[PDB]
C-alpha cells in the first residue's frame, strides 16, 4: 500500500487508519526518538506538523512541491489545539499567553 | 490513467531523493534509516543484507514502512545524518554495525581455508595469474600452501603510502581475497586463518 | 548522571535549611555566592541517588509531564498551582509542534534564545 | 576628457523639440548633446541596472539596427542575459503567451541536429526544416532563455526599437534607452541622451552596461 | 558518502543547515552552481561544493552582503 | 468486447528438457579432445536438428556486434 | 520479424590505463547476460594466442632451488618475474634471447639484446637486482608460441601464453522503454601480454563465430 | 530526553579513574576497551617525563601508543558525564567520543 | 571447428545429437552457452 494525500478524520485533522480509506502507516512515539537521536529536526517537524496534522500547513506545502519551491510553513498542528479545547471542557482554564 | 511518459518523469523525480525506511520495533536509531530509492518491478521492497543486521528484520513475513522525505532540509538531513553509508559504526559499541552475517561470513571462511594438500601442491605465481589459474581449471578453490607476490602497503609515519611487495606464504583463496583489500591495512596476513571474529575486526 | 540530579542542602544562608533541589541550581548559587556578595551565603550540599522513575517524574514543563506521567495527576496539580509552561525541552516541542532543541534545531533554538534578551 | 568623447552629437536639424534640455548647443549643421547633463544619466541608469542585476532579474537589449546587431550579443549573450538584434516580433512582451510557442519548435528544432535525429527524412527535408532555425534562432535565438517577462528593458536607439519600448510601458517593465536628438524620450523612464549611432558609441556603452550587470549580483 | 564534507565542516549538524541554505538558492531560482553538474539535484550539488571547498557558512554571508550592494548599483546606474 | 474469448497463459517454448554431457574421445590423430553430446527433449512441434541450428544462429547474431566496437 | 532477436549496441567503454579496462554491453535479451559472458570467460582465459617464456638456462647454477652469487632475489623469484615480462615475436615461431649485463644496480629489460624480429613493450620491467663490487650473469632465455596456460608440471622432458592476467564479468538488470528485464553485461578485463582490450575481446568472439559457423 | 551536548568544553578537570575490572579470576575486561573513546584530563604517565597529552582525545592511535610505550601503566584518569562542570546539559570533551563516523 | 553429425533419434519427442571433434575447453563453453539459449530463446507455437 502507498498514499500521497486524500481522506482526513473529523476529530483531529489527521489521515485515516490504514488499508480502507487512506494508507496511514503510523509513525509512533519510538520512531520520534530515533529521529531525535540521529538529529533530524526538520524531518521530525514535517512528520508531526506539515505532512500530517496542520490543515493550513498541508495546503501550503502541497502547492510548494507542485511549483518546485519545497520548504515548509508548519504553524500549529491542530491536534494540540484539540487538547486545549478538551482541557477547557473539563474545568481547567488553559490558554496561549503572549 | 498511467501513461508511459509518467514513469520516465518519475525516474528523474526519484534520482537524488532519499526514502526513510523503518522496521516495526524501532528500539535504536539504526532502525529508522534512509537510502537511495531504486526502481524495481515487484511489490516487495528490497532491503540490503548488511542493513538487516542493525535493524534486526529477518525475511519471514516482516513488513517495512517507507517515508518520502519532503522539503529541502529533510533531504539534506536524511542524506547526511540518517543515511545507510554514514551510519556504518554502531551507536552503543565502537565496532561496525553493517557486517557480514551468516551468508557473507560462510563464503569468506569457505574460500579462506587450508585443505589437505589438494591440486596445485606448491606452484608459485606473480599475483593475478594465481586467481586466473585457480578460477579457470586445474588448481582448486581452497588449494592451500602456495607462495605468491602480494603488493602490500601501509600509510605509516603520516606521509602517503609506504612499504613494498614480498613473497608471502598463503592459500589460493587468500590470494583472490587479497584483491578486495583497499591499498592499506594488513595486506595478505589479515586474509589467513578465518573470518569469524577477524572479519568484523 | 540523570539519576543523581537532586541534592539536599546542609548549611544555611541562601537555601531553606534542608529543601530538595537540583545540582544545577546549587552549583550556580554556590559559584555566585563564592565571589560576589558573601561567602556565608554559599551553603554546602550532598547528592541524593534518585531512581530512574523518581527522577523522570520531577520536571518543570507541564506538557512534558502530562505525556510521560499520568494525565489526571499532572493536570490537576498544575492547574491548582497555576504554573506557566514556557518549555524548551524536546518532549514539549514535539507535542506543541515546533523545532526541538537538538541537532539542526539546536542552532535555531540558540539563535532564538539570544533574541529574547532585548526583543 | 574621458571615453564619453565619441558621442558628442548626431541627427541634424530634424531633432525633436522634446529633446532640448540635453542639447549642449547646436553648431555646424547638427546640434550637440550636453554631456554635463549626460554625466548623471551616465550612471543613474547604470546604478539601477547594477541594483536590479543583484536581484537576479532579466535584461533585454534591443538593437535591430544592423550596426548594432552582430555587435550586441557580446554584451548580452556573452554576458548571459537577453537581447533581440532583429525584427522585434509583435507581442514578445505582451502576447508572449502565444509567442513562447514559437520558441518551443525552435528549441526542439535545435535538438534535431544535436543527435542522429538530424539524419531523419529526405536530405531535402532537413534543409526545409533547417531554414526555420535561421529565422527562429535569429528572431528568438537570443531570447529563448526567457521563461517569463523580464524586469527591466534596455534598448539602444529609442526610435527604431519603437514597438519594443511600447509593449514594455504596457506591461510595467522599466526601460533604459539611449535616445537621441530625433528620438522621442517620453517613452523612456531612464533616458541616456547619446548618439543613437556611431559604431563606437554603441559598443562602449553597450559593453559598459553588461559591465555593471555582470557583477551586479555581486 | 558525506565524510569528505564533514572534514571541512566539523560540526556535521551545520553541514545539513548550510547545505539546505545553499540548496534553496539554486532550487527556487536565484543562483547557478559553481561546480559542474552531472544530472544531480540541489541536495547533492550543494554537498559537492562543500567537499571541493568553495561554499560554507562564512562565504555565504560575504556573498549575500556583496549582492545587496550589486543590486543597489544596478538601480542607480543606467549604463 | 469478446467476453466468450477466455484467455490462457501462452507458452512458446518447444523444449521440455535439455542436458549436455562432455566425454573424452580419440579421433584419427589426436591427443586430448572432448565429445559434446547434447541430449534434448521436445514437445514434438520442431525437429532436434532444426532447433539446434536455430539456437546457434541466435548466438551468432548476438556475437556479430561484439567484434566491431 | 517475429523470430529475429534484439541485437546489442555497445558504444560505451571505460579505459583505466593501458593494461586494465572495463567494457560494457547494455541491451541484452533474457538469459544472454550469463550466456556469452561465461562463454567469453572460458575463451579469454583458455584460448588467447600469444608468446611467453618456457625454458631458461643459467650459467652459474644448473638447478632451480639455489642462489646465484651477487643476487638478492632467488632463482624461483626470478622465474616468476620472467613470466610477467611482455614479449612479442613477428615472423619467428621460437626465438632464443641472451641477457648480457653486469654492474652495481637494477637490471632493466632494456639491457637485453635487441634482435630483428624481437620486440619488448616494457623496457622498465624489473627482472633482478645486482649487489656491490662486481658480480656478473649471462643466461640464454627461450620464448615459445602457443594457445593457453601450460604449467611446469605438465612439461616432463611455467608458461603463460595468455595476455590476460585476470577476467571478471558482472551481470546486472536494466530497463529498455517498455520492458522488465534485460541483462547488462559489464566485462572487466586485466592484460599484460601486449594486447589491447578491444582487440582481445574482438578476437575472442571471432573464435566462437568460426566454431558456430559449421553448426549454423 | 531533555539532556543534550552544550558548549565546547568544561572549565574543571575532574574525572573517574579507569582500570581493568580484574573480576576474581583472569581479566574479564581489558583496559583498552574501557578507556577507548574517552578523553583524559591530565594523568602524569611514566616515571616523571610527559608521554600522554593534557586535554587530548584518546583515539585508537593514541591508545596503541600508550599500550606500546610501557604496558605496566594499569590505571589512567578520564572525564565523564557524571562529573561535568556545566549544569545545563554536558560538555563535548567531557562526554567522550561515541559516534557513527 | 566441430563437424555436426551422428543423430541418435530415440523417439519423435526425444533425441541425442553429438559433436565429436572439440578442443580442450570447447566442450563446456558452447554446450553451456547453447543450454542458456535453448531454454530461454526458443521460437515455437502454442
From Swiss-Prot, chain B:
Posttranslational modification:
Acetylated on several lysine residues in the presence of glucose.
Biotech utility: Co-administration of salinamide and rifampicin or salinamide and myxopyronin suppresses the emergence of resistance to both antibiotics.
Listed result of changing residue 102 to P: Resistant to antibiotics salinamide A and B
Residues that bind Mg(2+), according to the entry? 58, 60, 62
**Per the similarity annotation, which family is this?**
Belongs to the RNA polymerase beta' chain family.
Tell me, what does this protein do in biology? DNA-dependent RNA polymerase (RNAP) catalyzes the transcription of DNA into RNA using the four ribonucleoside triphosphates as substrates. Resistance to the antibiotics salinamide A, salinamide B, rifampicin, streptolydigin, CBR703, myxopyronin, and lipiarmycin can result from mutations in this protein.
Q: How does it assemble?
A: The RNAP catalytic core consists of 2 alpha, 1 beta, 1 beta' and 1 omega subunit. When a sigma factor is associated with the core the holoenzyme is formed, which can initiate transcription. The rRNA transcription and antitermination complex (rrnTAC) consists of RNAP, NusA, NusB, NusE (rpsJ), NusG, SubB, ribosomal protein S4, DNA and precursor rRNA; S4 is more flexible than other subunits.
Spell out the protein name for this chain: DNA-directed RNA polymerase subunit beta'
* Organism per entry: Escherichia coli (strain K12)
Q: Which gene encodes it?
A: rpoC
Which portion of the complete protein is shown here? 403 to 603 of 1407
UniProtKB/Swiss-Prot annotation, chain C:
Q: How is it modified after translation?
A: Acetylated on several lysine residues in the presence of glucose.
Applications: Co-administration of salinamide and rifampicin or salinamide and myxopyronin suppresses the emergence of resistance to both antibiotics.
Q: What does this protein do?
A: DNA-dependent RNA polymerase (RNAP) catalyzes the transcription of DNA into RNA using the four ribonucleoside triphosphates as substrates.
How would you summarize the oligomeric state and partners of this protein? The RNAP catalytic core consists of 2 alpha, 1 beta, 1 beta' and 1 omega subunit. When a sigma factor is associated with the core the holoenzyme is formed, which can initiate transcription. The rRNA transcription and antitermination complex (rrnTAC) consists of RNAP, NusA, NusB, NusE (rpsJ), NusG, SubB, ribosomal protein S4, DNA and precursor rRNA; S4 is more flexible than other subunits.
The family line of this record is: Belongs to the RNA polymerase beta' chain family.
Please report the name of this protein according to its UniProt entry: DNA-directed RNA polymerase subunit beta'
Source species taxonomy: Bacteria, Pseudomonadati, Pseudomonadota, Gammaproteobacteria, Enterobacterales
Q: Which gene encodes it?
A: rpoC
From Swiss-Prot, chain D:
Q: Which CDD domains match?
A: RPS2 (cd01425)
> What role does this protein play?
Required for ribosomal protein bS1 (rpsA) to bind to the 30S subunit.
> Pfam families, alphabetically?
Ribosomal_S2
Keyword NADP found = no
SUPFAM superfamilies for this protein: Ribosomal protein S2 (SSF52313)
Q: In the UniProt record, which is one GO cellular component term? A: cytosolic small ribosomal subunit
Q: Which InterPro entries match?
A: Ribosomal_uS2 (IPR001865), Ribosomal_uS2_bac/mit/plastid (IPR005706), Ribosomal_uS2_CS (IPR018130), Ribosomal_uS2_flav_dom_sf (IPR023591)
HAMAP family this protein is in? Ribosomal_uS2_B
Q: Name one GO molecular function term.
A: zinc ion binding
How does the record describe its quaternary structure? Part of the 30S ribosomal subunit, contacts bS1. Some nascent polypeptide chains are able to cross-link to this protein in situ. In collided ribosomes contacts ribosome rescue factor SmrB.
Q: Which residues carry this modification: N6-succinyllysine?
A: 107
Q: Supply the alphabetized keyword list.
A: Ribonucleoprotein, Ribosomal protein
| BP GO terms, sorted | cytoplasmic translation; ribosomal small subunit assembly
Please give the name of this protein.
Small ribosomal subunit protein uS2
Organism, scientific name: Escherichia coli (strain K12)
Which family does the entry's similarity section mention? Belongs to the universal ribosomal protein uS2 family.
Q: Which NCBIfam families match?
A: rpsB_bact
From Swiss-Prot, chain F:
**Encoded by which gene?**
rpoA
Q: Which residues form the signal peptide?
A: none
Which species?
A: Escherichia coli (strain K12)
Family of the protein in this entry: Belongs to the RNA polymerase alpha chain family.
Q: What is known of its domains?
A: The N-terminal domain is essential for RNAP assembly and basal transcription, whereas the C-terminal domain is involved in interaction with transcriptional regulators (such as CRP) and with upstream promoter elements.
What is the protein's quaternary organization?
A: Homodimer. The RNAP catalytic core consists of 2 alpha, 1 beta, 1 beta' and 1 omega subunit. When a sigma factor is associated with the core the holoenzyme is formed, which can initiate transcription. Both the N- and C-terminus interact with different regions of transcriptional regulator CRP. The rRNA transcription and antitermination complex (rrnTAC) consists of RNAP, NusA, NusB, NusE (rpsJ), NusG, SubB, ribosomal protein S4, DNA and precursor rRNA; S4 is more flexible than other subunits.
PTM summary: (Microbial infection) ADP-ribosylated on both alpha subunits by the phage T4 protein ModA. ADP-ribosylated on only one of the alpha subunits by the phage T4 protein Alt.
What result follows from mutating residue 26 to C?
In rpoA101; temperature-sensitive
User: What name has this protein been given in UniProt?
Assistant: DNA-directed RNA polymerase subunit alpha
Amino acid at each position: 500500500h502507498a498514499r500521497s494525500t486524500g481522506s482526513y478524520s473529523l476529530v483531529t485533522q489527521q489521515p485515516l487508519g490504514g488499508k480502507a480509506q487512506f494508507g496511514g502507516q503510523r509513525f509512533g512515539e519510538m520512531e520520534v526518538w530515533a529521529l531525535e537521536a540521529y538529529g533530524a529536526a526538520y524531518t521530525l517537524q514535517e512528520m508531526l506538523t506539515v505532512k500530517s496534522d496542520d490543515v493550513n500547513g498541508r495546503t501550503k506545502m502541497y502547492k510548494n512541491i507542485v511549483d518546485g519551491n519545497h520548504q515548509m510553513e508548519p504553524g500549529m498542528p491542530e491536534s494540540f489545539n484539540v487538547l486545549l479545547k478538551e482541557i477547557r471542557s473539563l474545568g481547567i482554564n488553559i490558554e496561549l499567553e503572549d | 490513467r498511467e501513461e508511459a511518459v509518467v514513469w520516465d518523469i518519475l525516474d528523474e523525480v526519484i534520482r537524488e531523493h532519499p526514502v526513510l525506511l523503518n522496521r516495526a520495533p524501532t528500539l535504536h536509531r539504526l532502525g529508522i534509516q534512509a537510502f537511495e530509492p531504486v526502481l524495481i518491478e515487484g511489490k516487495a521492497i528490497q532491503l540490503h543484507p548488511l542493513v538487516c543486521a542493525a535493524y534486526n528484520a529477518d525475511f519471514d513475513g516482516d513488513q517495512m514502512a517507507v517515508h518520502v522525505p519532503l522539503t529541502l532540509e529533510a533531504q539534506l538531513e536524511a542524506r547526511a545524518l540518517m543515511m545507510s553509508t554514514n551510519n556504518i559504526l554502531s551507536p552503543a559499541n565502537g565496532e561496525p554495525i553493517i557486517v557480514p552475517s551468516q551468508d557473507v561470513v560462510l563464503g569468506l571462511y569457505y574460500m579462506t581455508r587450508d585443505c589437505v594438500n589438494a591440486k596445485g601442491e606448491g606452484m608459485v605465481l606473480t599475483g593475478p595469474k594465481e586467481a586466473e589459474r585457480l578460477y579457470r581449471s586445474g588448481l582448486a578453490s581452497l588449494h592451500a600452501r602456495v607462495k605468491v607476490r602480494i603488493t602490500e602497503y601501509e600509510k605509516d609515519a603520516n606521509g602517503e603510502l609506504v612499504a613494498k611487495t614480498s613473497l608471502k606464504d598463503t592459500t589460493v583463496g587468500r590470494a583472490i581475497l587479497w584483491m578486495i583489500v583497499p591499498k592499506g591495512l594488513p595486506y595478505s596476513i589479515v586474509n589467513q586463518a578465518l573470518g569469524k571474529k577477524a572479519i568484523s575486526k | 548522571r540523570q539519576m543523581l540530579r537532586k541534592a539536599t542542602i546542609v548549611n544555611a544562608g541562601s537555601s531553606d535549611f534542608l529543601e530538595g533541589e537540583q545540582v544545577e541550581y546549587s552549583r550556580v548559587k554556590i559559584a555566585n555566592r563564592e565571589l560576589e556578595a558573601n561567602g556565608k551565603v554559599g551553603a554546602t550540599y550532598s547528592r541524593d541517588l534518585l531512581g530512574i522513575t523518581k527522577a523522570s517524574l520531577a520536571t518543570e514543563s507541564f506538557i512534558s509531564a502530562a505525556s510521560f506521567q499520568e494525565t489526571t495527576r499532572v493536570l490537576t496539580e498544575a492547574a491548582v498551582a497555576g504554573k506557566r509552561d514556557e518549555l524548551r525541552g524536546l518532549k514539549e516541542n514535539v507535542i506543541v509542534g515546533r523545532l526541538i532543541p537538538a541537532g539542526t534545531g539546536y542552532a535555531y533554538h540558540q539563535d532564538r534564545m539570544r533574541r529574547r534578551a532585548a526583543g | 576628457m574621458l571615453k564619453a568623447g565619441v558621442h558628442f552629437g548626431h541627427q541634424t536639424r530634424y531633432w525633436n523639440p522634446k529633446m532640448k534640455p540635453f542639447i549642449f548647443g547646436a553648431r555646424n549643421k547638427v546640434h550637440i548633446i550636453n554631456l554635463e547633463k549626460t554625466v548623471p544619466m551616465f550612471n543613474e541608469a547604470l546604478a539601477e541596472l547594477n541594483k536590479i542585476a543583484s536581484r537576479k532579474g532579466k535584461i533585454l537589449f534591443v538593437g535591430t539596427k544592423r550596426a548594432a546587431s552582430e555587435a550586441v550579443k557580446d554584451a548580452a549573450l556573452s554576458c548571459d542575459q537577453f537581447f533581440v538584434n532583429h525584427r522585434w516580433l509583435g507581442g514578445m512582451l505582451t502576447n508572449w503567451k502565444t509567442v513562447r510557442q514559437s520558441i518551443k519548435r525552435l528549441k526542439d528544432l535545435e535538438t534535431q541536429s544535436q543527435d542522429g535525429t538530424f539524419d531523419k527524412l529526405t536530405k531535402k527535408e532537413a534543409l526545409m526544416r533547417t531554414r526555420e532555425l535561421e529565422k527562429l534562432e535569429n528572431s528568438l535565438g537570443g531570447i529563448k532563455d526567457m521563461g517569463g517577462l523580464p524586469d527591466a528593458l534596455f534598448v539602444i536607439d529609442a526610435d527604431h526599437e519603437h514597438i519594443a519600448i511600447k509593449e514594455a510601458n504596457n506591461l510595467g517593465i522599466p526601460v533604459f534607452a539611449i535616445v537621441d536628438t530625433n528620438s522621442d524620450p517620453d517613452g523612456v523612464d531612464f533616458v541616456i541622451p547619446g548618439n543613437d549611432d556611431a559604431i563606437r558609441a554603441v559598443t562602449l556603452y553597450l559593453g559598459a552596461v553588461a559591465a555593471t550587470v555582470r557583477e551586479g549580483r555581486s | 558518502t558525506v565524510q569528505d564534507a564533514v572534514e571541512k565542516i566539523g560540526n556535521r549538524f551545520d553541514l545539513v543547515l548550510v547545505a539546505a541554505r545553499r540548496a534553496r538558492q539554486m532550487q527556487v531560482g536565484g543562483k547557478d552552481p559553481l561546480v559542474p553538474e552531472e544530472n544531480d539535484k540541489t541536495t547533492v550539488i550543494a554537498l559537492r561544493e562543500i567537499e571541493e571547498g568553495l561554499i560554507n557558512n562564512q562565504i555565504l554571508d560575504v556573498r549575500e552582503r556583496q549582492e545587496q550592494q550589486e543590486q543597489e548599483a544596478a538601480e542607480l546606474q543606467a549604463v | 468486447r469478446p467476453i466468450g474469448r477466455l484467455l490462457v497463459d501462452a507458452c512458446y517454448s518447444p523444449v521440455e528438457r535439455i542436458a549436455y554431457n562432455v566425454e573424452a574421445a580419440r579421433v584419427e590423430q589426436r591427443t586430448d579432445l572432448d565429445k559434446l553430446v547434447i541430449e534434448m527433449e521436445t514437445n514434438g512441434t520442431i525437429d532436434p536438428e532444426e532447433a539446434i541450428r536455430r539456437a546457434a544462429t541466435i548466438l551468432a547474431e548476438q556475437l556479430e556486434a561484439f567484434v566491431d566496437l | 520479424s517475429v523470430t529475429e532477436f534484439l541485437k546489442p549496441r555497445l558504444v560505451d567503454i571505460e579505459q583505466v590505463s593501458s593494461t586494465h579496462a572495463k567494457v560494457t554491453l547494455e541491451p541484452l535479451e533474457r538469459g544472454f547476460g550469463h550466456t556469452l559472458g561465461n562463454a567469453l570467460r572460458r575463451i579469454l582465459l583458455s584460448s588467447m594466442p600469444g608468446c611467453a617464456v618456457t625454458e631458461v638456462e643459467i650459467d652459474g647454477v644448473l638447478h632451480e632451488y639455489s642462489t646465484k652469487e651477487g643476487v638478492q632475489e632467488d632463482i624461483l623469484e626470478i622465474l616468476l618475474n620472467l613470466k610477467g615480462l611482455a614479449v612479442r615475436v613477428q615472423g619467428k615461431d621460437e626465438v632464443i634471447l641472451t641477457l648480457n649485463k653486469s654492474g652495481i644496480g637494477p637490471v632493466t629489460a632494456a639491457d637485453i639484446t635487441h634482435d630483428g624480429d624481437v620486440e619488448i613493450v616494457k623496457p622498465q620491467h624489473v627482472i633482478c637486482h645486482l649487489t656491490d663490487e662486481n658480480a656478473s650473469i649471462s643466461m640464454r632465455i627461450k620464448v615459445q608460441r602457443g594457445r593457453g596456460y601450460v604449467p611446469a608440471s605438465t612439461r616432463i622432458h611455467d608458461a603463460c601464453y595468455s595476455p590476460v592476467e585476470r577476467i571478471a564479468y558482472n551481470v546486472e538488470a536494466a530497463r529498455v522503454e517498455q520492458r522488465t528485464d534485460l541483462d547488462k553485461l559489464v566485462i572487466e578485463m586485466e592484460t599484460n601480454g601486449t594486447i589491447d582490450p578491444e582487440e582481445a575481446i574482438r578476437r575472442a568472439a571471432t573464435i566462437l563465430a568460426e566454431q558456430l559457423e559449421a553448426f549454423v | 530526553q531533555d539532556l543534550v551536548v552544550t558548549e565546547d568544553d568544561c572549565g574543571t578537570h575532574e574525572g573517574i579513574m579507569m582500570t581493568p575490572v580484574i573480576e576474581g579470576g583472569d581479566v574479564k575486561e581489558p583496559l583498552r576497551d574501557r578507556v577507548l573513546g574517552r578523553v583524559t584530563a591530565e594523568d602524569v604517565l611514566k616515571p616523571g617525563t610527559a608521554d600522554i597529552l593534557v586535554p587530548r582525545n584518546t583515539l585508537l592511535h593514541e591508545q596503541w601508543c600508550d599500550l606500546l610505550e610501557e604496558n605496566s601503566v594499569d590505571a589512567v584518569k578520564v572525564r565523564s558525564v557524571v562529573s561535568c562542570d556545566t549544569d545545563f546539559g554536558v560538555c563535548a570533551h567531557c562526554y567522550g567520543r561515541d559516534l557513527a563516523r
